[PDB]
Amino acid sequence: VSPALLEKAQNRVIDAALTFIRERAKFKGELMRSLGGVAATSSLLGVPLGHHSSFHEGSAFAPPRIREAIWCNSTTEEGKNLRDPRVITNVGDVPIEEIRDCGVDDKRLANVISESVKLVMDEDPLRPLVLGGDHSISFPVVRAVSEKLGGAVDILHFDAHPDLYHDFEGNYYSHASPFARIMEGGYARRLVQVGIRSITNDVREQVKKYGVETHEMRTLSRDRPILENLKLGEGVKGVYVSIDVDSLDPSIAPGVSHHEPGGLLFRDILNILQNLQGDIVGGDVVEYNPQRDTYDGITALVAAKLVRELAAKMSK
Amino acid sequence: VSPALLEKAQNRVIDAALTFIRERAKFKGELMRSLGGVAATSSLLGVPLGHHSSFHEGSAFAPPRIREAIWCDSTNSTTEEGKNLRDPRVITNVGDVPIEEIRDCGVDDKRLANVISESVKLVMDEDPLRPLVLGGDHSISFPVVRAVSEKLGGAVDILHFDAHPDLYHDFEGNYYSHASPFARIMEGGYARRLVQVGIRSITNDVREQVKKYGVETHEMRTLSRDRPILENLKLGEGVKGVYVSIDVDSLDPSIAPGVSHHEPGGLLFRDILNILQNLQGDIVGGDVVEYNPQRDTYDGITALVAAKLVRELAAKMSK
Amino acid sequence: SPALLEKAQNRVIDAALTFIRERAKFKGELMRSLGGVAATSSLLGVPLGHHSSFHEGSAFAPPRIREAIWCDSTNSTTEEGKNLRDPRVITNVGDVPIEEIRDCGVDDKRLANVISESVKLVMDEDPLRPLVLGGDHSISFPVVRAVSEKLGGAVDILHFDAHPDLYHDFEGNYYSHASPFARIMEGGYARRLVQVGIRSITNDVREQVKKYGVETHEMRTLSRDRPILENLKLGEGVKGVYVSIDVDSLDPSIAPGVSHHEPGGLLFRDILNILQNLQGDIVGGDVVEYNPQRDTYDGITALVAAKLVRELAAKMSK
Amino acid sequence: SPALLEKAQNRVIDAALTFIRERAKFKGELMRSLGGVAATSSLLGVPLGHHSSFHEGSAFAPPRIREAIWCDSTNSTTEEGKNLRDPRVITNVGDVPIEEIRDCGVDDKRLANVISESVKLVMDEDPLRPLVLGGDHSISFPVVRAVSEKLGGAVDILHFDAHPDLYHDFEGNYYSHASPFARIMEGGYARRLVQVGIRSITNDVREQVKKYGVETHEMRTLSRDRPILENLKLGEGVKGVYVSIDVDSLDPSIAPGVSHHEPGGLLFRDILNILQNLQGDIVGGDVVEYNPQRDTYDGITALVAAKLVRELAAKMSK
Amino acid sequence: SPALLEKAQNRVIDAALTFIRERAKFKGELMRSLGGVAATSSLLGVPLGHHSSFHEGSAFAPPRIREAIWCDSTNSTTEEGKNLRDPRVITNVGDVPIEEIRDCGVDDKRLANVISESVKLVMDEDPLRPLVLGGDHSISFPVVRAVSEKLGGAVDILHFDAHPDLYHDFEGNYYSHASPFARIMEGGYARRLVQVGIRSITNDVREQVKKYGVETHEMRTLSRDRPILENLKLGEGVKGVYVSIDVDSLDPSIAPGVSHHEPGGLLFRDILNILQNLQGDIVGGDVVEYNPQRDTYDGITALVAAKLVRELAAKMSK
Amino acid sequence: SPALLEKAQNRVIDAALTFIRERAKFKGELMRSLGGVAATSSLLGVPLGHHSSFHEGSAFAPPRIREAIWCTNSTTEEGKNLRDPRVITNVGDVPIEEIRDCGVDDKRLANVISESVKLVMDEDPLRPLVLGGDHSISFPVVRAVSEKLGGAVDILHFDAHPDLYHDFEGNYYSHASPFARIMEGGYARRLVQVGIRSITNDVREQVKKYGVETHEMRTLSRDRPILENLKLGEGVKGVYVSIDVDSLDPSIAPGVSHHEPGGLLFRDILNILQNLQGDIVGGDVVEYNPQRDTYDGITALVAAKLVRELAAKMSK
Ligand SMILES: [Mn+2]
Ligand SMILES: [Mn+2]
Ligand SMILES: [Mn+2]
Ligand SMILES: [Mn+2]
Ligand SMILES: [Mn+2]
Ligand SMILES: [Mn+2]
Ligand SMILES: [Mn+2]
Ligand SMILES: [Mn+2]
Ligand SMILES: [Mn+2]
Ligand SMILES: [Mn+2]
Ligand SMILES: [Mn+2]
Ligand SMILES: [Mn+2]
């Protein structure tokens, strides 16, 4: 296999993929500006990546399924208008499969994701709402938001799992290590984790090493008043919200790779998200696995709901 | 069929069965006794018996499905409160009593129950092992709790999670029904306190049974008032210790679809963990019953639910 | 032909109402022969779905609910100790043959009148009280109209639902399943309307709520409203209390068998807490919007609808 | 009370048969008013399941089948070009209210009489011919009895089933879904009985095949018998042809919605090849043993049952 | 604002087409560097479902089909022994980003032209030949138009489908999935059109068949047609052979993951028998109408579509 | 100490083989006391799935298959009465999980399987009918049948896959390699494969190397008369029948690890098995995966019908 064939294929396909995201972001930025009366518009960038998953890769197919459940009332829990393009709009998906088929390695793939995020952010007034994909994508996304904005953000992170593994199966880019990568890089100050019910003792050392505010399910009843009155981002560049759908009890969100019984109810996430104070600069909804959902696609609907509510907080 | 030949088949096959259990318990006992730093080890004994169920016998297939889910690729090996399931001193498998092959020798249910009791005693004799039984339908708790009580030399207190009191005196003339284990236990005085949680399915004649044996039945319709007591139970003070029986049908069927008796309006997963995490007392044994893999979803969610109940019970009983 | 239709319609409708009359009469006579009974919860199916905005499969619910009430996994005792094998606690009348009547070219206004008369035929047989199995939510309007007219005045309503069903005009359909409570409040048939489980509501509807003085409880305030909802006292000073249970009220994890899934709904124990604690003279009720064609393979939603019906019967029967 | 049941039974049954008469009379008038028609396939549901040995959920089948016929993923043209939107091609009468008659304490013998009379009320309305929707297979006996009595002689029967249903005595139940064709042959209602799809017959029952001259085609011989089965000519020199289709005759891969799964059954195209080719005067027929409680989430067995009803109607209507 | 759309639309389309060109140029140069190849089966996804009449879930199919092709329960050898691990046997180009282009307000004619141009970019890279993954059957018209224009003449088409897809006018959508072959035969892009598995056809569309000389083979004549169908020779006298495989051609017991369930369809082996024996120069093909949203939990239909692609590629690659 | 492990191994395997011995000793005495029999098909489960390449759920098949056997009627297609113990009888399951959990390696495990089959055969008139379990178990079974009978057998083998890989990912004991192990050891003379439709070019060389009669689905119509008239065993010790449930089309046997579209119908196998001539000394039904079956357990019923037909051919 010729080396300079793969290497210029890698260059050429990445460039054509990023140029598509650019023209799409440029189109939507221009649109929001012509309508006016908007400081921020939540912009959907899909990252259909599932190969960093330790169990099932079905995540890769989530973004299109979520956008179908978004755009199929048209009104969010607090009355923003979904058909208003100023509240929510689509940019596109990074064509992960086609980029990987060029032999691109994971480090460059992470860079492609980061560059995609910065293409969106460059077009005022778009702000990135990333659809996963597995949780490994949060690292490149948060990295991109921190670099573009010129400092750290605070994070609200819903998950069953801390995703703070220093070393997961020798895979630096594991969906079980993105917050390790994020904290190792200084991209976040505060990391507020909610839903946690699967945590190793080594990862409790990581929690201590980085000053993570890890809230476990076994103390949720004690924690509710705190969690329902979070205020983040004061004195840093803003607030980033990461929602891992496996944060929700498997009874209400079966469409995930990692079933962990004893999780959040839908209301738990909506109360916390709605009550959250701070300037939201970006967010993700990750680990929706359509291949593990029920036939009625209850988990696509839940995932779409969470995206709608994130967009209503982040659009202004 | 000569009765002679059948009787000798029975003795010999049972002997062979109990010797198998003896040798697995001997292995796991020596292992723990050579690791040291261990007062108790939760030790899985399967009793794959469904024939006492009133509606569906699928829980006979449960134990191997539960072990696989305990040891499942999507889960780490740490319990909610920090115990490492990779440490054998936290949890170990002994194995399954071969119910089907024994019944197939024409053994009657009284002798079958005796064989389940001997199995429990063979685990208990290998200190620091403590029996965490995997059912199987709920009928098995009678012979398990009889065996615990007889080996400890006295009464235990029981914390029992169920939709159903399982206190019938007489269910379809089957003494060993999955709906009378606790009538057998209470009749035998094998238990002092019996604290029942998740109850939402009870006939007026079993309400008699509750009053007659001074059973502490907590019904779902009084739960929110009961939370403060249930989150601070202290059992076993002045008897030989505490036995914890978890019927998976205690949980709402939205959580635990893989059961024979769907009863809407049940516990959430976290309600069992709150009670269990808060429970005080020397836990001497326990069981997880009525997982039915034939009624589970395609993803095996209830196997995972049962496996997590086993993991958190082991985390409490291991020491 | 003009006449054929007019003719057919009347004759087919009269034979259908006659079948209900005979069944009600049979069950009334039995109860009065047994004695020691003031009220018997009496099942009347209205298998109607064509008023649904997404799926019409709730037309199949009634017989599936009835089967699940008397099914092999459960016992015949309700949570608080009533015995369902006593016909004075619960009894079946039968199903209005909606399909057959529609298929005669009968419009929705006439159909509403047939549903109304069928309910009166059950109420004409003391001590029966109507427990209607839907069918979609549109049925509650003609049912509540009948109960009101029959008792000679207003009822207070406890309504479980994901949706307010208070639209003035859901897409030009007066008998929409999203408008039955608009028609009830317009008609004067209800004084209080207590709605529990709401999580889907537009701004135009919030104004319908203020306009009729409706007590709309949304999911986002559920945890705070618990003490109110676990202490309802309805119907004092009017003809009594009607309980309408839209199965969609419940989280789809508990009740997947419905046409509109709405995440973040009631737990089954949330409905039972409210319903078991409700004080007031329950004069009738309905369990609507169970859709067997969206249920799971084990038919859990059938079992959920049956338990709602069993627990509502425990309260209305006396 | 003795009188209480006897009187109710009679009045309830009379009101049920009156409803079926009015619906039959309405559709006969409709057809005669249109003209250009010798025969119209007329659906009579018989929602009975309790004559089953494993599951009773075939009681839910008729409305489900009707919905699947007049549905949305398909078109309305049969495979050889007949339009189902023409009422002269197919029409619904309605459902015998079996649950409600049985709930009056009516025994199976009188129940069979009710079914028989119901079929006869359809046959009294030129040009309607009965296409019965089960229900479990027990219903074929009262149906074929009625057709035989009404026409005044024997029919030939084409029967698709995984089981012969020629048990004299299945678990003491005279009206067993396992005994309908032993009752038909005993009574001389049928001359030929051509059974197709058989793959589950005990030797005792093999005796019964020879005892009554039954033409039983087993699955192991199907590929050899194809030529005969695709060239059937029935009814010559008697009153006509009755076609009974048990859905379990199909492979469970195609028809999972049945009570008794039997691997190695017919392909759907196996039934169409026989049915589209059959020569003879089709005078009635049935599609039984669809069980919606065992169907898949997409309700494919309901579609399978509907396409059988559609293709049988294509052949019976003229 | 108008200039905004004109501007953006052309620039978003240009960037999409650029993407496909670079993938096709990479894949073409790879085969040319390996040598020993005359034709490489090259996957182009068209994830378009909005021309669907019942369900649009075939929009999600291409990436599910590719995962199944390269799945870890299957090995990489076709039935007749071609190694799919060899890029010269099967390669991926990519998906036309339909959603994203449609969300710039691009109309259906302009979309068809983007699909055609995409096909043309693959065909420009010797020795790539286009194997299109739908998406719904609408996509065959702009694919086959592109093929024909590119080659400068007609093709013969082998079409597998339950449905002729020959409507002139399906609900006023020119681009309906029920009309692609009307659009094809009307534009003279095809000479012979051989259809196999047909079992859903209206009398009007029967007209269309005679009108265009379509060689429609219906399921009800299959065994009579087998020796013809197992010895097809197409393309002789024109530019080559296009094969269109609609997944609903298979019986729903085998391919449940489709929008239109039509009972009594082809067995998997029947498509392979025909395709394994087909003579002529295959210049393109598509596998259409796999609907992941209607598949079973184990994704069986994805594997069914994947194997169809693998066996078409084995035949198209030389 | 490693002495602790070796001891556990020796003593646990010894107890497990004594269990199978007492069960086989029981059923032998039962048939001999009953008389009128020369062969009784005796069920031995080998609940093993770790040699699987995709899913291990065939480990749970044996109990599920026995339950579907005695759940339908009670007469074999050719009128054998399955309530007659001389027609079919259960010995028991080899406790695979409990022997592996003592640290026993694959070679010693193959030996335990071989010894269990010999314990069955030592009891006249029992013949072993083995329930899998994945296809890897056919190697130790056929080796045991060949050693106890003192020579080779002919094999009829239904499968979608040849199972003739010399080296499957370094796993000598792969379920994709048992017939390579069997031919290498010379335990079989003829090997007639039916249902084959997944076959690599290196495995065609294995077919050539051992003179395997490999019938592919793409020649089934030409092969029918031949396959419906097989005569095996003349000149050798007899006939072994191996049934892999994935030989059947996935439409009728969805409960397997390896879906291969375009397989056999149920009659295809039944016509072949019923018409087969030769002295049947042994057989297996394998690769039933209960975890991938439909909610109704259709594949358990299929597998039970396959067992009943094989038990009717072998019992006499
Ligand atoms: Mn995560
Ligand atoms: Mn997670
Ligand atoms: Mn219990
Ligand atoms: Mn229970
Ligand atoms: Mn409603
Ligand atoms: Mn509603
Ligand atoms: Mn039958
Ligand atoms: Mn049958
Ligand atoms: Mn098509
Ligand atoms: Mn089609
Ligand atoms: Mn194999
Ligand atoms: Mn295989």
Numbering used by the authors:
A (entry chain A): 20 to 91, 95 to 338
B (entry chain B): 20 to 338
C (entry chain C), D (entry chain F), E (entry chain D): 21 to 338
F (entry chain E): 21 to 91, 94 to 338
Which statements did the authors publish about this structure?
In this route, ornithine is obtained from arginine by the action of arginase (arginine amidinohydrolase, ARGAH). Similarly to other eukaryotic (Di Costanzo et al., 2010) and prokaryotic (Bewley et al., 1999) orthologues, plant ARGAHs, are binuclear manganese metalloenzymes. Together with agmatinase, formiminoglutamase, and proclavaminate aminohydrolase, ARGAHs are grouped with the Ureohydrolase Superfamily.
In this work, ARGAHs from two model plant species, A. thaliana (AtARGAH1) and Medicago truncatula (MtARGAH), are structurally characterized by X-ray crystallography and small-angle X-ray scattering (SAXS).
